[PDB]
Design an enzyme around this catalytic site. Structure first.
Site, PDB file in Angstrom:
ATOM      1  N   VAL A  67      -8.057   4.012  -4.795  1.00  0.00           N
ATOM      2  CA  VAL A  67      -7.364   5.239  -5.446  1.00  0.00           C
ATOM      3  C   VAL A  67      -6.020   5.153  -6.048  1.00  0.00           C
ATOM      4  O   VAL A  67      -5.657   5.398  -7.081  1.00  0.00           O
ATOM      5  CB  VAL A  67      -7.725   6.527  -4.542  1.00  0.00           C
ATOM      6  CG1 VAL A  67      -9.226   6.731  -4.450  1.00  0.00           C
ATOM      7  CG2 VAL A  67      -7.038   6.640  -3.382  1.00  0.00           C
TER       8      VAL A  67
ATOM      9  N   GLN B  66      -2.156   7.932  -6.025  1.00  0.00           N
ATOM     10  CA  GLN B  66      -2.035   8.682  -4.898  1.00  0.00           C
ATOM     11  C   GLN B  66      -0.615   9.203  -4.157  1.00  0.00           C
ATOM     12  O   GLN B  66      -0.544   9.995  -3.333  1.00  0.00           O
ATOM     13  CB  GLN B  66      -2.786   7.680  -3.598  1.00  0.00           C
ATOM     14  CG  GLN B  66      -2.643   8.425  -2.431  1.00  0.00           C
ATOM     15  CD  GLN B  66      -1.850   7.787  -1.527  1.00  0.00           C
ATOM     16  OE1 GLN B  66      -1.357   6.608  -1.388  1.00  0.00           O
ATOM     17  NE2 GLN B  66      -1.127   8.661  -0.571  1.00  0.00           N
TER      18      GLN B  66
ATOM     19  N   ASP C 127       0.913  -1.390  -0.007  1.00  0.00           N
ATOM     20  CA  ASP C 127       0.032  -0.191   0.147  1.00  0.00           C
ATOM     21  C   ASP C 127       0.921   1.320   0.185  1.00  0.00           C
ATOM     22  O   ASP C 127       1.959   1.229   0.563  1.00  0.00           O
ATOM     23  CB  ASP C 127      -0.871   0.025   1.413  1.00  0.00           C
ATOM     24  CG  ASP C 127      -1.946   1.011   1.041  1.00  0.00           C
ATOM     25  OD1 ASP C 127      -2.895   1.210   1.973  1.00  0.00           O
ATOM     26  OD2 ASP C 127      -2.163   1.622   0.110  1.00  0.00           O
TER      27      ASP C 127
ATOM     28  N   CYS D 191      -8.407  -1.760  -4.641  1.00  0.00           N
ATOM     29  CA  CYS D 191      -7.356  -2.004  -3.729  1.00  0.00           C
ATOM     30  C   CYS D 191      -7.899  -1.728  -2.177  1.00  0.00           C
ATOM     31  O   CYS D 191      -8.925  -2.450  -1.989  1.00  0.00           O
ATOM     32  CB  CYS D 191      -5.876  -1.155  -4.142  1.00  0.00           C
ATOM     33  SG  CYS D 191      -6.519   0.607  -4.549  1.00  0.00           S
ATOM     34  N   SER D 192      -7.179  -1.054  -1.580  1.00  0.00           N
ATOM     35  CA  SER D 192      -7.745  -0.688  -0.315  1.00  0.00           C
ATOM     36  C   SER D 192      -8.899   0.530  -0.270  1.00  0.00           C
ATOM     37  O   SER D 192      -9.892   0.426   0.165  1.00  0.00           O
ATOM     38  CB  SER D 192      -6.702  -0.289   0.751  1.00  0.00           C
ATOM     39  OG  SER D 192      -7.285  -0.610   2.348  1.00  0.00           O
TER      40      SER D 192
END
Ligand code: 4UN
Length: 280
Positions: free
Chosen positions: A220, A260, A182, A216-217
């Site tokens: 974004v 991001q 992440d 994903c989480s």
């Protein structure tokens, strides 16, 4: 500034120039993207109703581009334009225990045949996504849907699973990239390029499919990078020239924070660079 196209033949030197003085021109372009789309309302995502439906309280769909449950129509999911059409992807947060039925409901209603997951479930002890598909070959109920895993193939960097879903049967393929931490980037360009090309191959093999799901989480960073890569890799096959700035811009008109981190943006360039190096 909505677009900064770079000729295939100018790219190596251009990108060299971008990375100069500690990625100085890169940080400026990335900084220029910062406020894109951000004038748009997020009001439905903010209703009290919807509070437990959001994994992260600052990552909410725009009212204008949010996907709706047919119908309390609320899911944290956005429609995303691609290289080929306007509702080419649906992008969503990693499902929560309390929204996984919603997620499969959306999958059914939107005629989705391919899901791309580029997060793990738990990373460094932090929860990122619920384990929202069956853990084995036994069929499970998800609201009004029944889902059964038909196969799971584990490769070093991703795992492909086939589900059958029925309501009250479609085949779904789930492409799970396991090695993208992440807020980070995969260890190589070659890995994600090859994964992107695999998925797209199957997309081509999916006649009449609805949108491709990518998540994903938060839906974004890794999700936005994935899709920006999917789009430029197609541009590298069709065009004199690639527009990384334009792609990320476009994603931002549709969802906050798409790509991001500065490094994810740098990595998109590293990918295009290496593909062209390989060609030359
Ligand atoms: C509440 C709150 N959650 C956050 C988080 C997670 C977070 C929270 C606190 C410190 C660092 C990160 C949410 C978040 C979590 C993961 C990702 N990466 S993604 O899974 O690839 O989309 C992107 C955003 C975030 N990270 O970057 C941005 C922008 N938002 N910020 O405020």
């Amino acid at each position: 500034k909505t677009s900064c196209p770079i000729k295939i033949n100018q790219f190596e030197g251009h990108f060299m120039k971008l990375q100069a003085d500690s990625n100085y021109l890169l940080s400026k372009e990335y900084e220029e993207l910062k406020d894109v789309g951000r004038n748009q309302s997020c009001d439905i995502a903010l209703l009290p109703e919807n509070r437990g439906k959001n994994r992260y309280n600052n990552i909410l769909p725009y009212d204008a581009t949010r996907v709706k449950l047919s119908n309390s129509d609320y899911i944290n999911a956005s429609y995303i334009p691609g290289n080929n059409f306007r509702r080419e992807y649906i992008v969503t947060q990693g499902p929560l225990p309390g929204t996984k039925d919603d997620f499969w409901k959306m999958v059914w209603e939107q005629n989705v045949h391919n899901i791309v997951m580029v997060t793990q479930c738990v990373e460094k002890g932090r929860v990122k996504c619920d384990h929202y598909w069956p853990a084995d070959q036994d069929s499970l109920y998800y609201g009004d849907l029944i889902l059964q895993m038909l196969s799971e193939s584990v490769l070093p960097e991703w795992t492909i699973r086939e589900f059958k879903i029925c309501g009250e049967h479609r085949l779904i393929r789930h492409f799970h990239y396991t090695v993208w931490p992440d807020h980070g980037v995969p260890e190589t360009t070659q890995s994600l390029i090859q994964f992107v090309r695999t998925v797209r191959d199957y997309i081509n093999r999916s006649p009449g499919a609805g949108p491709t799901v990518v998540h994903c989480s938060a839906g974004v960073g890794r999700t936005g990078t994935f899709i920006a890569l999917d789009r430029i890799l197609q541009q590298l096959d069709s065009k004199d020239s690639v527009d990384i700035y334009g792609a990320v811009h476009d994603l931002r008109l549709h969802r906050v924070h798409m790509v991001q981190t500065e490094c994810q943006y740098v990595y998109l360039h590293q990918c295009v660079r290496d593909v062209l190096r390989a060609r030359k």
